[PDB]
Design a protein around this ligand. Structure first.
Ligand SMILES: COc1cc2c(cc1-c1c(C)noc1C)[nH]c1nc(C)nc(Nc3nn(C)c4ccccc34)c12
Length: 112
């Protein structure tokens, strides 16, 4: 069950990095560069930053013991975006599209 779940998590993350989703996934590929973007309040608002490259590194290091932990990091990444940005910001629309890609496939997780 666990090995199958982690292959599903790796598949989902590989799809989230695929060129077909790149037009809305790209802001989530790497840690938010607070200095480059001039987001001087980011670290005051977001206590636990998360991004797709960090999630990839954790899967490669076998840090996630099951799908629930992996899913919690993916949702943390989207939640930080929803917390920091105004609700009508273009990046929030991109986050909702990438989260729909993730949730529809994560719902198909092997359950035995
Ligand atoms: C404005 O939220 C971001 C911009 C970026 C970003 C990350 C974020 C971000 C925040 C904050 N909260 O969640 C995420 C995700 N990474 C970027 N890398 C580069 C090279 N340029 C960017 N520029 C963008 N500036 N604006 C206003 C955007 C709107 C739409 C798309 C990207 C830009 C971003």
């Amino acid at each position: 069950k666990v090995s199958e779940q982690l292959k599903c998590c790796s598949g989902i993350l590989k799809e989230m990095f695929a060129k077909k989703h790149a037009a809305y996934a790209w802001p989530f590929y790497k840690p938010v560069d607070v200095e480059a973007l001039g987001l001087h309040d980011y670290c005051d608002i977001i206590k636990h930053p998360m991004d797709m490259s960090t999630i990839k590194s954790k899967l490669e290091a076998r840090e996630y013991r099951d799908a629930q932990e992996f899913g919690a990091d993916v949702r943390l990444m989207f939640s930080n975006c929803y917390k920091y940005n105004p609700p009508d910001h273009e990046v929030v629309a991109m986050a909702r599209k990438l989260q729909d890609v993730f949730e529809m496939r994560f719902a198909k997780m092997p359950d035995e």
